[PDB]
């Protein structure tokens with residue numbers, strides 16, 4: 001017996017108004033146009049928990065592949081999240097005992113008819129709950145499963161990025177533009193280590209399709225989550241994903257703080273990047289495949305960072321043998337505290353295990369030390 005979500009996972013503390021209660025109380029009809037899963041390439045419709053008029057159709061096939069994007073897996077997670085997060089006692093009980101056991105078994109056994117029956121039973125039960133009870137409950141939530149945002153973002157991702165993922169892997173003349181992804185759990189760990197919080201400014205130099213930027217906004221409520229990406233197709237996919245994300249957020253009454261991108265342009269000699277650096281609290285840069293030249297450019301860009309700013313990277317920013325001399329006396333690298341960490345399993349897309357990452361903090365004074373002596377179920 002297993003669950004679609006880890007009911008024992010870590011819970012995230014909400015440090016900003018994630019659910020817009022007034023919006024929900026004033027909006028009962030969803031008019032958004034989210035990408036329906038069934039449009040990607042037996043069926044069942046999943047009834048929206050908050051909007052009576054919304055239902056999404058999923059293709060249900062335990063034979064036809066599955067794996068990577070698994071429609072049934074998403075449903076299992078959504079239905080469980082209802083029981084875990086969106087329902088008030090008592091209904092959370094009825095749902096928990098009445099649907100989950102059969103939903104999970106039917107799944108594990110590749111039992112189509114049983115799986116669909118559990119879904120249809122889930123829909124019937126959900127429609128019997130007074131809407132205002134669900135909303136009144138959301139209003140009390142102060143903590144949520146760390147996996148919620150991850151799974152919520154994965155849904156958006158399966159809909160907007162996955163279908164055209166191949167466009168992100170076109171022949172790369174330079175390693176500088178090779179696409180690599182930092183994964184959700186790694187991002188969650190690192191944002192926490194840097195204490196990314198409400199009102200902060202977050203920047204991702206080389207944002208890819210925006211995964212790191214949107215996660216920063218959703219899980220920390222940053223005043224501004226910004227990303228710059230130069231590749232054309234990564235940039236188009238960023239727009240599609242961003243668009244789908246806004247619709248899904250509305251479907252769940254979630255607030256999405258300011259998200260901004262500087263697309264199809266270099267972050268080098270980028271005036272918006274330059275004007276934002278000084279106010280950034282956290283700067284992320286996956287320089288794993290960056291060459292010496294580019295790293296030098298990144299170095300230049302970071303010169304105006306403020307005291308306290310934390311920079312996350314996969315390769316140290318400062319040469320391991322960086323010693324203060326006479327040609328680098330004013331470089332911000334001189335007052336940067338560097339801390340190395342081991343990469344946990346499956347933190348990045350290019351490797352299963354191994355590796356490391358760094359968190360460099362901008363300190364007020366210089367470091368004397370530098371002077372010379374003289375993309376699965378649970379139990």
Ligand SMILES: Nc1ncnc2c1ncn2[C@@H]1O[C@H](CSCC[C@H](N)C(=O)O)[C@@H](O)[C@H]1O
Nearest residue numbers: 177180181182206207208229230266267286
């Ligand atoms: N000068 C430059 N300006 C903007 N983006 C650049 C750049 N040099 C490299 N990049 C981009 O930086 C990206 C980093 S790989 C993606 C990282 C992204 N932070 C994520 O975790 O999903 C590459 O896809 C590449 O397109």
